[PDB]
Structure 1
Amino acid sequence: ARVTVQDAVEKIGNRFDLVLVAARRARQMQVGGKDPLVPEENDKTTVIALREIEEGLINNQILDVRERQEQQEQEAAELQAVTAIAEGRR
């Protein structure tokens, strides 16, 4: 099947939870660049192509979870505020 996928649903007593754990955060990593990701480059997927590795994926960040934190409206309020992101050419 896939790598470390059935291990994330057995470690915690829920499946629908793991979804947003690697959803509202994963899609947020791209719209925020890549700097917000402070963990080491160890927890990262591997893509075999041209004798090198690219992309990034996820499902390898879920380790230190918690109950109550932030609401749900600020997730994309101060995120797109600190970093605007765009696309320019020479």
Structure 2
Amino acid sequence: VEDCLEVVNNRFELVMMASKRARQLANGVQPLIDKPTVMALREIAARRIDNALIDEVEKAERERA
């Protein structure tokens, strides 16, 4: 959790970003790298997923719906 507090300064923004990534992963999607929240935190700490990419995936899922 130290790397997750290293890639972003604020903690609540990290919580909201991991919540959005876990909501995207729970509906069924391929991850960047077993629980959805733990995989979201591992994808955050590996500097693979960004908030802009999360918003792009959410916009693609809203357009596909």
TM class by smaller structure: 0.5 to 0.7
User: Residue by residue, what CA displacement relative to the aligned partner does 1:32-80 show, whole Å, maximum 9, x if unpaired?
Assistant: x133x2x23xxxxxxxxxxxxxx3332100114356x848x8476236x
Residue 19 of structure 1 corresponds to 15
Same amino acid, percent of matched pairs: 32
**Higher mean C-alpha displacement, 57-66 vs 21-30:** 57-66
**Partner residue of 2:42 out of 53, 57, 60:** 60
Number of residues of Structure 1 aligned to a counterpart in Structure 2: 57
After TM superposition, what 4+ stretches of structure 1 lie above 2 angstroms from structure 2? 55-58, 64-67, 73-79
Task: Pick closer, same or farther for the CA change 1:76–1:20 going to 2, 3 Å.
Answer: farther
Report the Cα distance in structure 2 between the residues aligned to 1:29 and 1:17, rounded to whole angstroms. Answer: 18
Bigger helix share: 2
What is the root-mean-square deviation of aligned Cα atoms in Å?
3.1
TM-score (norm 2): 0.54
Residue 29, structure 1, aligned to residue 14, structure 2: no
Q: 1:21 to 1:66 in 2, by over 3 A?
A: closer
Structure possessing the higher radius of gyration over alpha carbons: 1
> TM-score normalised to the size of structure 1?
0.44
Pairing 1:30-45 to 2, within 5 Å after superposition: 30-31=26-27, 33-35=28-30, 37=31, 39-40=32-33
- Residue ranges of structure 1 left out of the alignment (5+ in a row): 41-54, 82-90
